[PDB]
Amino acid sequence: SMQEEDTFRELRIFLRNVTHRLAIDKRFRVFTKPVDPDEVPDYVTVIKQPMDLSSVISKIDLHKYLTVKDYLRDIDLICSNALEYNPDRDPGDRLIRHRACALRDTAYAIIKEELDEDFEQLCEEIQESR
Numbered sequence: 023s024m025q026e027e028d029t030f031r032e033l034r035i036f037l038r039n040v041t042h043r044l045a046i047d048k049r050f051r052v053f054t055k056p057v058d059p060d061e062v063p064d065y066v067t068v069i070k071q072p073m074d075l076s077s078v079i080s081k082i083d084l085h086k087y088l089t090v091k092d093y094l095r096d097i098d099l100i101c102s103n104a105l106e107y108n109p110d111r112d113p114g115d116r117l118i119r120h121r122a123c124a125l126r127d128t129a130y131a132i133i134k135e136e137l138d139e140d141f142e143q144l145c146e147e148i149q150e151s152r
C-alpha cells in the first residue's frame with residue numbers, strides 16, 4: 023500500500039540522517055570508506071563481510087533495510103570486523119577498536135533516544151507480512 027511505502031520512506035530518511043551524523047564525526051572517518059585493497063590486500067581476505075558507512079548509505083538507497091534491527095546488524099558488523107581485524111595491544115589497533123565501539127554505541131544511543139518503538143514495531147509487522 024501507499025501507507026506502507028510512506029512508512030518505509032520515513033525509515034530511509036531516519037536511517038540516512040543517523041548515518042550522516044556518524045559519517046561527519048572525525049572519530050569515524052576510517053569507517054566511512056571501504057578498506058583499499060592496495061593499502062590492505064589481506065583485508066578483503068579475512069574480512070569475509072566487509073561493511074563501512076558508504077555501503078550502509080548505498081543499502082538504504084536500494085531499500086535493503088525494512089527495519090532498524092536490520093540496519094543495526096550492519097552497524098554491529100563495522101564494530102565486530104574492526105575488533106576481528108585489529109586485535110593487537112598496539113596503540114594503532116587499540117585506537118581503531120575504541121573508535122569502532124564508539125561508533126556502535128553512538129548509533130545505538132541515537133536510536134534509543136530518537137526511534138519510536140511503535141514505528142519500529144510497524145516496520146517489523148510490514149516486513150513479516152511479505
Ligand SMILES: O=c1cc(Br)cc[nH]1
Pocket residue numbers: 035036037038039040
Ligand atoms: O534523520 C532525521 C532527521 C530529522 Br531533523 C528528522 C527526521 N529524521
Ligand SMILES: O=c1cc(Br)cc[nH]1
Pocket residue numbers: 067068069070
Ligand atoms: O567463515 C568465515 C570466513 C572468513 Br574469510 C572469516 C571468518 N569466517
Ligand SMILES: [Cl-]
Pocket residue numbers: none
Ligand atoms: Cl587519526
